[PDB]
Every structure is written in structure tokens, then in C-alpha cells.
CSV table of C-alpha atoms in Angstrom, one decimal:
chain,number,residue,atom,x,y,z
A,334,UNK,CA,-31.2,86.2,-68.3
A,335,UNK,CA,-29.9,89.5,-66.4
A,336,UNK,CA,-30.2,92.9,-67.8
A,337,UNK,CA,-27.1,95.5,-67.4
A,338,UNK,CA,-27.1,97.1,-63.9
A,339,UNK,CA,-23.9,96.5,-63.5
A,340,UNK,CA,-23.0,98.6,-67.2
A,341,UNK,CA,-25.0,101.6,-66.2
A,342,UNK,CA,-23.5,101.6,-62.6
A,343,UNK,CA,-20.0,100.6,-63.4
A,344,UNK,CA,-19.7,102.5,-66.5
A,345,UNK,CA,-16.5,103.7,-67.6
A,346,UNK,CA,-16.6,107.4,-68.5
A,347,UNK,CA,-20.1,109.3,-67.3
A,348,UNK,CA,-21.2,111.9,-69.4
A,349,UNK,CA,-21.9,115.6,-68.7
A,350,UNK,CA,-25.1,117.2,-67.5
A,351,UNK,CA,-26.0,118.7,-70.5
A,352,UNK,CA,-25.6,116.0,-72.7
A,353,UNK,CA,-27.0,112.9,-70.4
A,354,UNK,CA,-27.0,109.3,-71.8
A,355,UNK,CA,-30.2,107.4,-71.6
A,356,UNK,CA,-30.4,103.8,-72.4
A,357,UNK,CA,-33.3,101.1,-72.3
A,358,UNK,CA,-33.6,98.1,-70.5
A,359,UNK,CA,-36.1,95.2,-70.9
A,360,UNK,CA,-36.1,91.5,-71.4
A,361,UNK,CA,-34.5,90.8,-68.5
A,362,UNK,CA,-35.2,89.4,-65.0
A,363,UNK,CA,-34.0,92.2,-63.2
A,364,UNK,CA,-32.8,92.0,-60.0
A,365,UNK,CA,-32.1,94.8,-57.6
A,366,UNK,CA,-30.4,93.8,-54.5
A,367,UNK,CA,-27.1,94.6,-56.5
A,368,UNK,CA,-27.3,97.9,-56.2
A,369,UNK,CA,-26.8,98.6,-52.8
A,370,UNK,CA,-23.4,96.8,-52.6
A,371,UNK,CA,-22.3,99.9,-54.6
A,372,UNK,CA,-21.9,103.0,-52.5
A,373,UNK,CA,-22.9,104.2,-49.0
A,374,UNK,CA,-25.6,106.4,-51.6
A,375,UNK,CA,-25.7,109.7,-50.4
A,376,UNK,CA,-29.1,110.1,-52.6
A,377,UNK,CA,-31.6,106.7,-52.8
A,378,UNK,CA,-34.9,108.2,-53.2
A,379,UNK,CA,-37.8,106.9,-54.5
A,380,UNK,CA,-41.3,108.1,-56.0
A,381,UNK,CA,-44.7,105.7,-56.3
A,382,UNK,CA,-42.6,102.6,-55.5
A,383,UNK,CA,-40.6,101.7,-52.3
A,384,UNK,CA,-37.1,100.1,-52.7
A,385,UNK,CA,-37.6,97.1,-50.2
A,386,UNK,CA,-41.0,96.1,-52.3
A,387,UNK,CA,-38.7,96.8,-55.6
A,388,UNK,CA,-37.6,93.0,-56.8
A,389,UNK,CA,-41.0,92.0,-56.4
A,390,UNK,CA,-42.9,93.7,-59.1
A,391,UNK,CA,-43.0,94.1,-62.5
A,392,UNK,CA,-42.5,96.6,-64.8
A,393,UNK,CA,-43.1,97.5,-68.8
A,394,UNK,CA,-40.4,99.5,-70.2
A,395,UNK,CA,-37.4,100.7,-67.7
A,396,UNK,CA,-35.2,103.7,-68.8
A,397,UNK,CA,-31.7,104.4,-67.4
A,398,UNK,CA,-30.3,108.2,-67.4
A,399,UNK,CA,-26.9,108.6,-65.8
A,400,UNK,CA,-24.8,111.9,-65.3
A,401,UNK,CA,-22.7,114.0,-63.0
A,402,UNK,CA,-23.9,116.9,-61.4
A,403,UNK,CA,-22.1,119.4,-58.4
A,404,UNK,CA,-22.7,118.4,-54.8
A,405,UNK,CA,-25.3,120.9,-53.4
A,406,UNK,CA,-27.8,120.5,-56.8
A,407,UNK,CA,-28.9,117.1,-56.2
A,408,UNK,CA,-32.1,118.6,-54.5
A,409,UNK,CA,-33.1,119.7,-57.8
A,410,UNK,CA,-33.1,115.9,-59.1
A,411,UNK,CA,-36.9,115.5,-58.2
A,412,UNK,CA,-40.4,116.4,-59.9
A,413,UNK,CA,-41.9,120.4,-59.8
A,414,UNK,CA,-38.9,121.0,-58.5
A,415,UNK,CA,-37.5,124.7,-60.4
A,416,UNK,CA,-33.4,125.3,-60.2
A,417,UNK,CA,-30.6,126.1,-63.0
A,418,UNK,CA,-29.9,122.6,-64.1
A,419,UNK,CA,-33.5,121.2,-63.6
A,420,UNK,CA,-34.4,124.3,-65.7
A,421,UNK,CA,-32.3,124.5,-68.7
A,422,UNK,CA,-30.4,120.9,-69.1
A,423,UNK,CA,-32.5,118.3,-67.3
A,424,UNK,CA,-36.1,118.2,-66.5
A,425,UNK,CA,-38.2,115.1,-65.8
A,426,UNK,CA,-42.0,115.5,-65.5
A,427,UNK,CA,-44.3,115.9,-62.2
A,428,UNK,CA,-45.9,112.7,-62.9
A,429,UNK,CA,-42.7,111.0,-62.0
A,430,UNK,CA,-42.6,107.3,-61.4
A,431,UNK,CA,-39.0,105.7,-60.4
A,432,UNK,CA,-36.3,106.6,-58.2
A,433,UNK,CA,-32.7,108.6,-58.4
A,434,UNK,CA,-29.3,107.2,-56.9
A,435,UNK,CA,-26.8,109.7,-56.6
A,436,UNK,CA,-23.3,108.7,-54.6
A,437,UNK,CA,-19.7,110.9,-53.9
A,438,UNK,CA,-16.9,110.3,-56.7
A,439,UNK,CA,-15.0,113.1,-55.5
A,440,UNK,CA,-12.3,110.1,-56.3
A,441,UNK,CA,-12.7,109.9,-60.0
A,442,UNK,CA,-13.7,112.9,-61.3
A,443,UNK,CA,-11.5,116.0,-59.0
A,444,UNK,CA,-8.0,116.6,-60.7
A,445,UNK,CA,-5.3,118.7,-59.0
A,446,UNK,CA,-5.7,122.3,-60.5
A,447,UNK,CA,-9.3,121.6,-62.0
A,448,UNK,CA,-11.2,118.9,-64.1
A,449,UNK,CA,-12.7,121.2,-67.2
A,450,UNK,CA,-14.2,118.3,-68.8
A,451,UNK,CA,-17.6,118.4,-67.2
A,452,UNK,CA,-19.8,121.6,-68.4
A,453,UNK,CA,-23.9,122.8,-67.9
A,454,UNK,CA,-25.7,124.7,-69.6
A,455,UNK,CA,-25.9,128.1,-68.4
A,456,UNK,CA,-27.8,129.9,-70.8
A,457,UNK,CA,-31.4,129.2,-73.0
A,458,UNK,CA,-34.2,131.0,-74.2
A,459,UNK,CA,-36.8,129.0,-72.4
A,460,UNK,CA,-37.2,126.2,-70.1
A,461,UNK,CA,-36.9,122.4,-71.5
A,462,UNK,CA,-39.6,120.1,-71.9
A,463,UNK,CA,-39.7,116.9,-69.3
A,464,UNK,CA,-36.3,114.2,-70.4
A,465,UNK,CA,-35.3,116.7,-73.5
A,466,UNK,CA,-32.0,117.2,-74.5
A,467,UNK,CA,-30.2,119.7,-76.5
A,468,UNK,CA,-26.2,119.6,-77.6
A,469,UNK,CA,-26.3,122.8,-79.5
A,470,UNK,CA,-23.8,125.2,-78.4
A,471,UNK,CA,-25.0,128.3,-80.3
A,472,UNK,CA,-23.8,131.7,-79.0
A,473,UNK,CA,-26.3,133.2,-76.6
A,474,UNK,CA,-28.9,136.1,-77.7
A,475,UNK,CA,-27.6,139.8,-76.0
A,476,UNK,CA,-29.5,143.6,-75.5
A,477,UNK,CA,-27.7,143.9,-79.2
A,478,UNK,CA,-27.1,141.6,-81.8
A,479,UNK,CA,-24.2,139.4,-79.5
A,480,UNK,CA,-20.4,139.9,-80.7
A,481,UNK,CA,-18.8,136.7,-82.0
A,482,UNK,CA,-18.4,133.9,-79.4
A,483,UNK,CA,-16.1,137.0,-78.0
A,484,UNK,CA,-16.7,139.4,-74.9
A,485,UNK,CA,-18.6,142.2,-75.4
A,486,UNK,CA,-21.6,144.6,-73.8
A,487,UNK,CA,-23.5,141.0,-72.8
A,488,UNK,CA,-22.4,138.5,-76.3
A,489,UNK,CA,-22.1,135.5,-73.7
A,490,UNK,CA,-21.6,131.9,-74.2
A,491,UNK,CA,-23.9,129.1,-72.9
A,492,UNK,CA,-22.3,126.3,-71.5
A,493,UNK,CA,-19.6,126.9,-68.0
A,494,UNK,CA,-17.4,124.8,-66.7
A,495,UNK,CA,-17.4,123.1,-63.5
A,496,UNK,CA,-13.8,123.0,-62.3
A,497,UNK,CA,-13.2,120.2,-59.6
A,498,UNK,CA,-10.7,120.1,-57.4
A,499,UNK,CA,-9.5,117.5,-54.7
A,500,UNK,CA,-10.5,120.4,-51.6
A,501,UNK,CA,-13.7,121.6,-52.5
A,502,UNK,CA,-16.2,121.7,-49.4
A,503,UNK,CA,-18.6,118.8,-49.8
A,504,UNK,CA,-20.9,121.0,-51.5
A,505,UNK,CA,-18.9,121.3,-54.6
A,506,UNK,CA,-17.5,118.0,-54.6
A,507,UNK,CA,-18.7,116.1,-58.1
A,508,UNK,CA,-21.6,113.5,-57.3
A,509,UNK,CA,-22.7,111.1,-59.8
A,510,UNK,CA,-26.3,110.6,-60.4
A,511,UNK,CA,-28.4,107.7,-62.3
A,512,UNK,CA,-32.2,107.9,-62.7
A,513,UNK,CA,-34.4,104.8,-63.3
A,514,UNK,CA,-38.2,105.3,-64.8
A,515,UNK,CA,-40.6,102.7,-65.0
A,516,UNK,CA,-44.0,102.5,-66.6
A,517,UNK,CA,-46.9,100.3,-64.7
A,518,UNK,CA,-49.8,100.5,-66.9
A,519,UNK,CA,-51.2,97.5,-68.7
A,520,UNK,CA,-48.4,95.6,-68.5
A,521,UNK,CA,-47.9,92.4,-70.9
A,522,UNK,CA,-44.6,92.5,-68.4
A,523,UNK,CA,-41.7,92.5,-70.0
A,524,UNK,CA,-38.8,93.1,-67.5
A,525,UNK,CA,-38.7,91.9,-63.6
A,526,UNK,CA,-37.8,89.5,-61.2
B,1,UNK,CA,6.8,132.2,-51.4
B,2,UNK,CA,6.4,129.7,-54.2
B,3,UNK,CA,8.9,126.6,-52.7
B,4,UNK,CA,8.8,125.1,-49.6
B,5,UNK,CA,11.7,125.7,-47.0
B,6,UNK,CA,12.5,122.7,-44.8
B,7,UNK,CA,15.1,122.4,-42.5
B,8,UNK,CA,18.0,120.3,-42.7
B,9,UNK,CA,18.1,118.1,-40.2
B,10,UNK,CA,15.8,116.3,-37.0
B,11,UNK,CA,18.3,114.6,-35.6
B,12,UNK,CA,16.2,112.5,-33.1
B,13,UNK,CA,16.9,109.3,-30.9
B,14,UNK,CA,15.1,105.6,-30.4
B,15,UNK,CA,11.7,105.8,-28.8
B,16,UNK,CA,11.4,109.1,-29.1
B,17,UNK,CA,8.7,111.7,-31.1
B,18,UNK,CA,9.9,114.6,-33.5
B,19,UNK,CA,8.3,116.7,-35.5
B,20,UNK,CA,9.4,118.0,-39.4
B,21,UNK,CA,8.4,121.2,-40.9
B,22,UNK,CA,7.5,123.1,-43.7
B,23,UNK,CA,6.7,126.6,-44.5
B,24,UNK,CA,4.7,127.9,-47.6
B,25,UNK,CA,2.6,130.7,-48.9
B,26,UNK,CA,-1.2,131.6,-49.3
B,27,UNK,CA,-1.1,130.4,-52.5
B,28,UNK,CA,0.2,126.2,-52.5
B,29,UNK,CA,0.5,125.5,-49.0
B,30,UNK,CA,-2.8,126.9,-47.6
B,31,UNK,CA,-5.0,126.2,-50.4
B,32,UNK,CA,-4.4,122.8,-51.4
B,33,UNK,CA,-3.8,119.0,-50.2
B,34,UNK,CA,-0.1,118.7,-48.7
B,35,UNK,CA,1.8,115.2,-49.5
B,36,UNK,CA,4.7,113.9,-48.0
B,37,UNK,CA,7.3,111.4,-49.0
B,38,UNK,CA,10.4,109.7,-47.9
B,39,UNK,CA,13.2,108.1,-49.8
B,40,UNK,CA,16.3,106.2,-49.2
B,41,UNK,CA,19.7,105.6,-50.7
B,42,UNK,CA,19.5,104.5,-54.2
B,43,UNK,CA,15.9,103.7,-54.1
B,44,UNK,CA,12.7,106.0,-55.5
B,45,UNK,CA,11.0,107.8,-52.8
B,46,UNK,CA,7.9,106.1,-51.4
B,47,UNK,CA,5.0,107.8,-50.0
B,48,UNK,CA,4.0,108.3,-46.9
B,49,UNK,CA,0.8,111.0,-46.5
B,50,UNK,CA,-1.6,112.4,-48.6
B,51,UNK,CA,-4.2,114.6,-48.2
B,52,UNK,CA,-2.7,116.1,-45.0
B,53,UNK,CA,-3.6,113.4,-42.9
B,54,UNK,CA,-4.3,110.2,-44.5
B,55,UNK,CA,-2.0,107.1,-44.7
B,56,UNK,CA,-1.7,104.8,-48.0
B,57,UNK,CA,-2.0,101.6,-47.0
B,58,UNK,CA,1.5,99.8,-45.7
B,59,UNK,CA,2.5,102.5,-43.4
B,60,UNK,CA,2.4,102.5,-39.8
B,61,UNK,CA,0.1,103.8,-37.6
B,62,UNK,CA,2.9,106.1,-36.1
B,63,UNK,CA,3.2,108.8,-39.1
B,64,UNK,CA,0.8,111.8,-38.7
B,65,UNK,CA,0.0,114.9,-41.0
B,66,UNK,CA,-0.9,118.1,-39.7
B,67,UNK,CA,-1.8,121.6,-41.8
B,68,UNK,CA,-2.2,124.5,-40.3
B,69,UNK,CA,-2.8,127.8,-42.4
B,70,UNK,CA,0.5,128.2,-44.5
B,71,UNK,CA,2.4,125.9,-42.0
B,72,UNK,CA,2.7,121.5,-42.8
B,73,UNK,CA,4.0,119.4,-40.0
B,74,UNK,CA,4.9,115.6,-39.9
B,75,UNK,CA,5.0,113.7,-36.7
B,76,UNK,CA,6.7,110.8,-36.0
B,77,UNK,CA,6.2,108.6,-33.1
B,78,UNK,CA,8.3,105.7,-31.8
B,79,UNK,CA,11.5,107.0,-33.5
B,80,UNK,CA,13.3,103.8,-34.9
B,81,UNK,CA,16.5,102.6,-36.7
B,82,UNK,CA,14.9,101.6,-39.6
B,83,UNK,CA,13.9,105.6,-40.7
B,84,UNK,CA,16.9,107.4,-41.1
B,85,UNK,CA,16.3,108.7,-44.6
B,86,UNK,CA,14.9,111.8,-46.6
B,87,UNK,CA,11.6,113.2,-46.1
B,88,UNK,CA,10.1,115.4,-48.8
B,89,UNK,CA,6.9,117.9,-49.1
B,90,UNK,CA,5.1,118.2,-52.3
B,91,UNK,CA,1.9,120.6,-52.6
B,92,UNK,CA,0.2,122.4,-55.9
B,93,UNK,CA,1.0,125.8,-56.7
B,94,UNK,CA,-1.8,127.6,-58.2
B,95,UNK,CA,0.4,130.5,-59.1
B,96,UNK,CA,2.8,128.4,-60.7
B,97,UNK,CA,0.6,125.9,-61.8
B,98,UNK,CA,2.7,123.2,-61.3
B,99,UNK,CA,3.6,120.9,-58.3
B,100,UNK,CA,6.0,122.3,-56.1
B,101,UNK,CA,8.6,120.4,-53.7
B,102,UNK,CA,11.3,120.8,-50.5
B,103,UNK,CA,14.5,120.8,-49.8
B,104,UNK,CA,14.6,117.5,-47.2
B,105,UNK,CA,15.7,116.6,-44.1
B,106,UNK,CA,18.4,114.0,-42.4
B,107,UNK,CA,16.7,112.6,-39.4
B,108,UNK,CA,19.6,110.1,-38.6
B,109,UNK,CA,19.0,108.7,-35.1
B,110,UNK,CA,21.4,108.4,-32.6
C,2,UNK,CA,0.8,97.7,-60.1
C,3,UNK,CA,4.1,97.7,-61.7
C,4,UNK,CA,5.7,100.5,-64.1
C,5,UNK,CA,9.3,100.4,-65.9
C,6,UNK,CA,11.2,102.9,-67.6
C,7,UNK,CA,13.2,102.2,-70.6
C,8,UNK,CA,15.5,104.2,-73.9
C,9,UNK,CA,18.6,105.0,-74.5
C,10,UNK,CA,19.9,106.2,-71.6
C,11,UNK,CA,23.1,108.4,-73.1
C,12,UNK,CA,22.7,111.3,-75.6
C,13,UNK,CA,24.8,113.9,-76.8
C,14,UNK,CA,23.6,117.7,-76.7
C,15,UNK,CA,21.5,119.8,-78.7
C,16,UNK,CA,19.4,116.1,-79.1
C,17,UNK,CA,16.5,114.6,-78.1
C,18,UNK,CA,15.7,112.3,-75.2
C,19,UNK,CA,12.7,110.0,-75.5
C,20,UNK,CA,11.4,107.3,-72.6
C,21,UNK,CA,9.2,105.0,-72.3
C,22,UNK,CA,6.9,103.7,-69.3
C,23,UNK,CA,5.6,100.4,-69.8
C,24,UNK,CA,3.1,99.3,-67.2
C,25,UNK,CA,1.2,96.2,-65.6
C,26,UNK,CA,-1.8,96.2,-63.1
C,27,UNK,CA,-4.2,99.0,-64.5
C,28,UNK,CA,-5.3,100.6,-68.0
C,29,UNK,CA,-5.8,104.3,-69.1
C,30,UNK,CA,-9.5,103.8,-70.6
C,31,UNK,CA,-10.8,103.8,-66.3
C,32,UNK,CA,-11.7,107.1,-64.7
C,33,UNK,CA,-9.1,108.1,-61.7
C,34,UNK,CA,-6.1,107.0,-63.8
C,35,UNK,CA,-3.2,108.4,-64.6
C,36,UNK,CA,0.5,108.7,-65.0
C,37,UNK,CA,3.1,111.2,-65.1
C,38,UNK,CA,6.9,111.8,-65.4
C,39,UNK,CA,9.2,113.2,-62.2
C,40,UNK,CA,13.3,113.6,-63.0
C,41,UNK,CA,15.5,114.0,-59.8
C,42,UNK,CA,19.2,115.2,-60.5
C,43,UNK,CA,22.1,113.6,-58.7
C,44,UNK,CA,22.1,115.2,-54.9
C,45,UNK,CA,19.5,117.4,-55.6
C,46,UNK,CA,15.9,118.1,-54.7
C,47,UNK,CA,12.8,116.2,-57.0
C,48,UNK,CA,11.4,117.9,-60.2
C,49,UNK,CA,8.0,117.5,-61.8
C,50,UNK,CA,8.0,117.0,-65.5
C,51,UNK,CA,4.5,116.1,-66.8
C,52,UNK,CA,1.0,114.4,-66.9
C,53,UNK,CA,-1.5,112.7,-68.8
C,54,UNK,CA,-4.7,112.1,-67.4
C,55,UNK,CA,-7.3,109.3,-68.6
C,56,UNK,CA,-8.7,111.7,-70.8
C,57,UNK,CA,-5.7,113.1,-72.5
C,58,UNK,CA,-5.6,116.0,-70.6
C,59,UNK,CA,-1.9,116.8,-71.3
C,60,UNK,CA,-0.8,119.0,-67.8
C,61,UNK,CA,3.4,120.1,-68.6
C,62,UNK,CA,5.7,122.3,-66.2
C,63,UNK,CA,4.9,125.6,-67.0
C,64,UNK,CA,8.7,126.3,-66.6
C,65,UNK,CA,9.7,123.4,-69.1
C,66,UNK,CA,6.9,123.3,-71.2
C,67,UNK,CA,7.6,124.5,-75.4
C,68,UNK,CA,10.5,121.5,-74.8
C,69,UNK,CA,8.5,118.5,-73.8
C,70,UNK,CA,5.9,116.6,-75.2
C,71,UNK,CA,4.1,113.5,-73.7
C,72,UNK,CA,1.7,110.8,-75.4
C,73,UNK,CA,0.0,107.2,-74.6
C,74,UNK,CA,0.0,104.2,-76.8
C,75,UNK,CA,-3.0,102.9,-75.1
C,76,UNK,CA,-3.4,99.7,-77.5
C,77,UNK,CA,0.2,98.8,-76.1
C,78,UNK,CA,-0.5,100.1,-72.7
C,79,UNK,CA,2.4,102.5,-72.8
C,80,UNK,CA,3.4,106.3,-72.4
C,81,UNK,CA,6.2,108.3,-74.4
C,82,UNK,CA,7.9,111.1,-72.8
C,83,UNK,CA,10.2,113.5,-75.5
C,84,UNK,CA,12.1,116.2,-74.2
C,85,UNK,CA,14.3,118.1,-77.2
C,86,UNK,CA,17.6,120.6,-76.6
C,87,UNK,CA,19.4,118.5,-73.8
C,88,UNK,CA,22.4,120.0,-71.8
C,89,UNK,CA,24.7,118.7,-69.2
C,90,UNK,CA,22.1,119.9,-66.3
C,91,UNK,CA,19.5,117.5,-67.4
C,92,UNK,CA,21.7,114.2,-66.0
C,93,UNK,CA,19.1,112.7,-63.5
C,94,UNK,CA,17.0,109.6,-62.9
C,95,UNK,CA,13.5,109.7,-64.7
C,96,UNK,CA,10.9,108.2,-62.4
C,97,UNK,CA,7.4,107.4,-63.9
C,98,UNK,CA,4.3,107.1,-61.5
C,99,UNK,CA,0.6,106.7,-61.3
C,100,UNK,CA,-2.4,108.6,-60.0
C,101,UNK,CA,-5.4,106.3,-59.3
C,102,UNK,CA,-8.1,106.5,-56.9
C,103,UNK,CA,-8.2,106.2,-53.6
C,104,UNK,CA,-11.0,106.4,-50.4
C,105,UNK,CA,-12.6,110.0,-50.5
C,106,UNK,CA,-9.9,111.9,-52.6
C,107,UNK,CA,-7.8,110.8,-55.8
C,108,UNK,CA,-4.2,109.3,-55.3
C,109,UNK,CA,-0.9,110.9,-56.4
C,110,UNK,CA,2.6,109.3,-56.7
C,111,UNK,CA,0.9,106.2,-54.8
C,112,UNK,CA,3.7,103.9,-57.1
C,113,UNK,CA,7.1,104.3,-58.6
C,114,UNK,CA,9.0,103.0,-61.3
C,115,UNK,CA,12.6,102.0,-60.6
C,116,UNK,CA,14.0,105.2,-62.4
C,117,UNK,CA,16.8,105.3,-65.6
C,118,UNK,CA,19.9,107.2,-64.8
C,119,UNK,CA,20.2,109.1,-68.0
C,120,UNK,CA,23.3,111.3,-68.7
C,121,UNK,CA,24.0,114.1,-71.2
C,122,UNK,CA,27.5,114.6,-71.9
C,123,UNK,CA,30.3,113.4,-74.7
């Protein structure tokens, strides 16, 4: 019995940044020469495991994160790695195991005049712990008590906008990005093939 | 400023190349994608460029796009009988916010 | 892809016009998609009415916005277009299109309906 590649790939509406979507797979026989009939994948990168030597193996539990991200942060997709949206909306630990697949839409997500749909998390107190999320959209702390989700001395808001448009340089074209984690370790194997 | 300004008419002849203009502003013509369409007699318009030099597919090789600052030019190669219609820009205007379109031009061969 | 326009086509002024675009060959629950409304008047130059993206992102004229308002019956795969206060300027042909995807940048105006020659007048 297969497993859903082809839901988390060919999903219908991604989600934001700072509210990623993580789903399980297992009980499957999974098989990854699917993937690559996808995309040209700007981004196939892989950590402790090498994609040839990939539907060979076998794994214990096998998460699936997908989301959509600018064009010139996929660097910071990747373990010990310190940015703005590996600091504050998406952080995955430096004992990483599994590999990231990040490919152009440019052709879904860009509307004429800007797509305000997809936002980040701009501002937190501190840094997130490794595959946390937080949806909370509390107005952010200022010098002085902070106005009222209004402008002010500082009184800012967390989350920005992205604002994609069908010209933007390649750099701030919208890329969307799926992460795969697998676990190894005394494995009564539950998912491969 | 904020509408495009094409002239009339081309006025061309068969096997022959001519060129179609149109003139905008800093604000829709140079900062966003310019399309161009072409419609006939009692019939919608059907498209023709996008994205200032990219064909949808079902359209000869002989149509070209070309944008150039605040200028648009279309290019059309191996003049034929079979293309004497309307051709018509359409580009975003940020200012306006809203899409923005030309006047048209003839182009009957003779 | 196929898209078809349909109402009443004949209205008196100081009413209201409503349309209708039924469609064939794609749905509004995909990312890319969308459709939008474009009148033309008789002899003159085309005019951009609305749009409605795949996420209800509801894009008007600026210029004839606070008259129109434009909503999908996704269940029946179908849009509504209402436009209120017609005059005698407002005779055209009402064209509804799609925006899809396309190789390395989205798709605009790709298809057409076959239009409805609507006229205002008693």
C-alpha cells in the first residue's frame, strides 16, 4: 500500500511560513522515485542520507512539513543555520536527519498588484525552539507600553506581508518548500520500500 | 501618462515585417509585464503575448514582444492576409491600480 | 476550457444588471485560477471590470468600484457579476475570462467567453 507523496507535493493550497503544516507518514511502502518527475527542484538537499541510496532503506516514523518561503531565504532552510525566518517562525534542530525540496511557483502564488495572503513573522521576544510553532498574533512589546495595534513611538505589529508580484527578480520570486525527517534508530520498520 | 497611446494604423503589405507601438509612463508600462491582443470582427479578442515576450501556445512563431523602458513594441514577420484586424496593449497601472488598455490599430494589408 | 455568459440581456435605467459565467475545464478550489469580468462598448476601446481570485480576493476598478459587486457559486462552478445604477453608456458586450497558470509566470485573459451584447435603454 502507498503512502501520500503525491498529497503533500500536489497539495492544493500551501500554507504560510509562520503557520507550517506537518503531517505524518507511516504504514506505507514508500517509494521515492516519484518525486523527481515533479519540478526541475531548484533546492534537493540532503543530510545523513543520499537520495540515490533513498528507496532502499528503511525508516521509523517520517514527518512531512510543507510551506512557502521568498526566493533568496531558502539558504536558511538547513541545521545551525541563524537568519529571520529560521529564527523566529521555523527552526529545525542541528542533529538534523532528512532532506528539503524547494522548487519555483512563481506560477501559482504571484498576482498582478501583489498576493497579501502569505505573511512571516517579523517580530518575537526570543528565538523558537527546533519544529515549534506559534499562531499568536499579539501586538509586539515597545521602549513604552506599545499603543494599540496602532502606529506610535515603536507599538509595532508582528507578522509582514510578502507581496508577490509576476516581475520580481528571481530573488523575490515565491518558492515552495517541503521538508522530510526521518528517524533511524531501532527500528521495528514501519514505513519503506 | 496613465493610458497607452497607439497609433492608428500599420498599413503594411504581404511578406513584409512591421512594427506596432505603444507609449506609456514610469508607472504601468516600465514596471510591469506588457500583454498584447488582437481581435477581429464580431469575435472576442484572442491573445497573442504575454509577459513581453512569450507566446501562448497556437500562435506563430512570427509574433515578437519587445519592452524597452516606458516604450512596448510588437513585431510582425511574414505580413499575411489572414491578420488584418485590431491589435490591443494591456499593462497594470500601479497608480491606478487597475489594468490599463490602448486605443488599436488597422493593419489592413494591401 | 470553456466559459459562457448568460442574464437578461435588456434593462431599463436606474436598475440592476446581474450576469452570470458558467464554466467547463477547470475549478476555483486550485491555486493559479481565476476569473474576471471585461465589458467593451460598441466601436470603442476594452474596459476592465473585476476579479476574483482562487482565494476570494475580490480586485474591482477603482473607477467603478461602490457600483459592482462580484461573487462565486463554487458548488455550482459559477461566478455572479452585479453592477446597480445603469445608464445608456453602459451598452457593451460583457466578456468573462480566466487567469490560470502558465510556464514561469501566471496567465491572464489566456480564454474568452463569447460575450452578451447587453443594452440599457427603453
Amino acid at each position: 500500500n502507498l503512502c501520500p507523496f503525491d498529497e503533500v507535493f500536489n497539495a492544493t493550497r500551501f500554507a504560510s511560513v509562520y503557520a507550517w503544516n506537518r503531517k505524518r507518514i507511516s504504514n506505507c511502502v514508500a517509494d521515492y522515485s516519484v518525486l523527481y518527475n515533479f519540478a526541475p527542484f531548484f533546492a534537493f538537499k540532503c543530510y545523513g542520507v543520499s537520495p540515490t541510496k533513498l528507496n532502499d532503506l528503511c525508516f521509523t516514523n517520517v514527518y512531512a512539513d510543507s510551506f512557502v518561503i521568498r526566493g533568496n531565504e531558502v539558504s536558511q532552510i538547513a541545521p545551525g543555520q541563524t537568519g529571520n525566518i529560521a529564527d523566529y517562525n521555523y527552526k529545525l534542530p542541528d542533529d538534523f536527519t532528512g532532506c528539503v525540496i524547494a522548487w519555483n511557483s512563481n506560477k501559482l502564488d504571484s498576482k498582478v498588484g501583489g498576493n497579501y495572503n502569505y505573511r512571516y513573522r517579523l517580530f518575537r521576544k526570543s528565538n523558537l525552539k527546533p519544529f515549534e510553532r506559534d499562531i499568536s498574533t499579539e501586538i509586539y512589546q515597545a521602549g513604552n507600553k506599545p499603543c494599540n495595534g496602532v502606529a506610535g513611538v515603536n507599538c509595532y505589529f508582528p507578522l509582514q506581508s510578502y507581496g508577490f508580484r509576476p516581475t520580481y527578480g528571481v530573488g523575490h520570486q515565491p518558492y515552495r518548500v517541503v521538508v522530510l525527517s526521518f528517524e533511524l534508530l531501532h527500528a521495528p520498520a514501519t514505513v519503506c520500500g | 501618462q496613465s493610458v497607452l497611446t497607439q497609433s492608428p494604423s500599420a498599413s503594411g503589405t504581404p511578406g513584409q515585417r512591421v512594427t506596432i507601438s505603444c507609449s506609456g509612463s514610469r508607472s504601468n508600462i516600465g514596471s510591469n509585464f506588457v500583454y498584447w491582443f488582437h481581435q477581429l470582427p464580431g469575435t472576442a479578442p484572442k491573445l497573442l503575448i504575454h509577459s513581453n515576450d512569450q507566446r501562448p501556445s497556437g500562435v506563430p512563431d512570427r509574433f515578437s514582444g519587445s519592452n524597452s523602458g516606458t516604450s512596448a513594441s510588437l513585431a510582425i514577420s511574414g505580413l499575411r492576409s489572414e491578420d488584418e484586424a485590431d491589435y490591443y496593449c494591456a499593462a497594470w497601472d500601479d497608480s491606478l491600480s487597475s489594468w490599463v488598455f490602448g486605443g488599436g490599430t488597422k493593419l489592413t494589408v494591401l | 476550457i470553456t466559459l459562457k455568459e448568460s442574464g437578461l440581456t435588456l434593462v431599463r435605467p436606474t436598475q440592476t444588471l446581474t450576469l452570470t459565467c458558467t464554466f467547463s475545464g477547470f475549478s476555483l478550489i486550485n491555486s493559479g485560477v481565476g476569473v474576471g469580468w471585461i465589458r467593451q462598448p460598441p466601436g470603442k476601446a476594452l474596459e476592465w471590470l473585476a476579479l476574483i481570485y482562487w482565494d476570494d480576493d475580490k480586485r474591482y476598478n477603482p473607477s467603478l468600484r461602490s457600483r459592482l459587486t462580484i461573487s462565486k457559486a463554487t458548488s455550482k462552478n459559477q461566478v455572479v457579476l452585479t453592477m446597480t445604477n445603469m445608464d445608456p453608456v453602459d451598452t457593451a458586450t460583457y466578456y468573462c475570462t480566466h487567469r490560470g497558470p502558465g510556464h514561469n509566470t501566471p496567465i491572464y485573459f489566456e480564454f474568452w467567453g463569447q460575450g452578451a451584447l447587453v443594452t440599457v435603454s427603453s
